[model samples]
Target: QTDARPLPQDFETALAELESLVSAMENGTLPLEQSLSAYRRGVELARVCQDRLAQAEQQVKVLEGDLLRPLDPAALD
Candidate 1:
């Protein structure tokens, strides 16, 4: 059993944008200023997505009665 009411409706959309941003960012194919701007926005968007992912992971842990924590963002940096 799970409750899907913990997140806002924009979760998926924000996640999508964050994913795209990460892809674009990881490739290193953008202008310096633009990339910096995107990086800033992507950081915020990624934070939101991170929160949602963390919450969902915890939900699964709760149902499974197991301990779990999200991977740190710094490991990706």
Candidate 2:
């Protein structure tokens, strides 16, 4: 009767959830079945986070006209 929970679409939320999952797994209290399920979800969330970051980076590069440079904090002041 269990249904898969929808994955978080936002990068920050996904990353937070992934971190929690890891923490829970590390605590070593989850039953074997639940631990396996959490592992699967963690893997999926990791992939999602990676893809979102890569997509964002690509957009930034395009906006920078492919001349990506190290961010300068002094410029912000």
Candidate 3:
């Protein structure tokens, strides 16, 4: 899930580019063809970023003792 953008530097760079693409489309300035292309690229980048986050989460869990804590349901309030 990448646009061959010379291989992004990190999660921030990938996410930022995705955001920029969406923003431009939202501005309603591009033609249908260009907008669709941007949308596809954006979706791909989102998946890439999501995958990065999941991997990072696993890294954190392993680094911090890998303990699972009970959630406080009341916190939702």
Candidate 4:
């Protein structure tokens, strides 16, 4: 369920930011303090991405009821 109000957090932004953080860590140059903070943020981002994915799957299932139903049923008229 995507509501027209507040936008669901963008999956791409979460994923991309996580990747960048990990890449910086992999570079093996960031200070210990910075790395720890970045890693923490990355973990949070990863968790969000996972949760968003699950939500998206559920929305599809919920919307399935609309898939097979015709736009207008002749019986109704």
Candidate 5:
């Protein structure tokens, strides 16, 4: 049972739901139609999760670059 609506949860929530969908689909219990629909939802969730990760990585890169800036020793004097 999967909802076709867009996933609005955070990255962790989306990932947990994706894992649940994968487990259910792997069980081979759902009908072919339901399985296909769940698969589609999972794909969407996965895409969102990937985007979140990329966004985090970019932020980390910026943070690291900022940290690399040299301190103003002259100002300390």
Candidate 6:
């Protein structure tokens, strides 16, 4: 049986939560059990953030073609 915790609504929210978890863990104040739970949550949040980033990157590639080129300032001038 799994816990019924809901995921953060968006990528930014998830990333923020992940950052807080990392900071808390690094501070070394949480008890061992809570630390483990935070670790698990951090892992899940990390995966979600990475997957969203990958999907966004793929969409950009589809829109921009195979090569992602830098914008030329001279062209704009």
lDDT of 1 at 11: 67
Which candidate number maximizes lDDT?
5
Question: lDDT of all predictions, in order shown?
Answer: 0.70, 0.87, 0.78, 0.77, 0.87, 0.83
The best candidate in terms of TM-score: 5
- Write candidate 6's Cα lDDT for 1-77 as tens digits: 22258988578999999999999999988888888888888888999999899999999978796354454345543
Model 1, position 48, has a per-residue lDDT of 82
lDDT of 2: 0.87
- Candidate 2: RMSD to truth: 8.4
| TM-scores of the models, in the order given | 0.53, 0.77, 0.70, 0.68, 0.81, 0.75
Report the backbone clash tally of model 1: 0
RMSD of 3: 8.4
Kindly list the per-residue Cα lDDT of model 5 for residues 1-77, writing each as its tens digit: 65857685689889999999999999999999899889989899999899999999999999987887765345543
Q: Candidates 2 and 4: which is better by TM-score?
A: 2
Off by over 4 Å in 4: 1-8, 65-77
Candidate 3: list runs displaced more than 4 Å: 1-9, 66-77
Candidate 2 on 10-35: residue-level lDDT in tens?
Answer: 79999999999999999999898889
Q: Candidate 2 regions off by >4 Å? A: 1-3, 66-77
Candidate order by decreasing TM-score: 5, 2, 6, 3, 4, 1
Worst 10 residues of 3 by lDDT: 68-77
Per residue, candidate 1 scores C-alpha lDDT tens digits across 12-58 of 98788778878887898877887887777776776787888899998
Q: What is candidate 3's local distance difference test score? A: 0.78
Off by over 4 Å in 1: 1-9, 23-29, 66-77
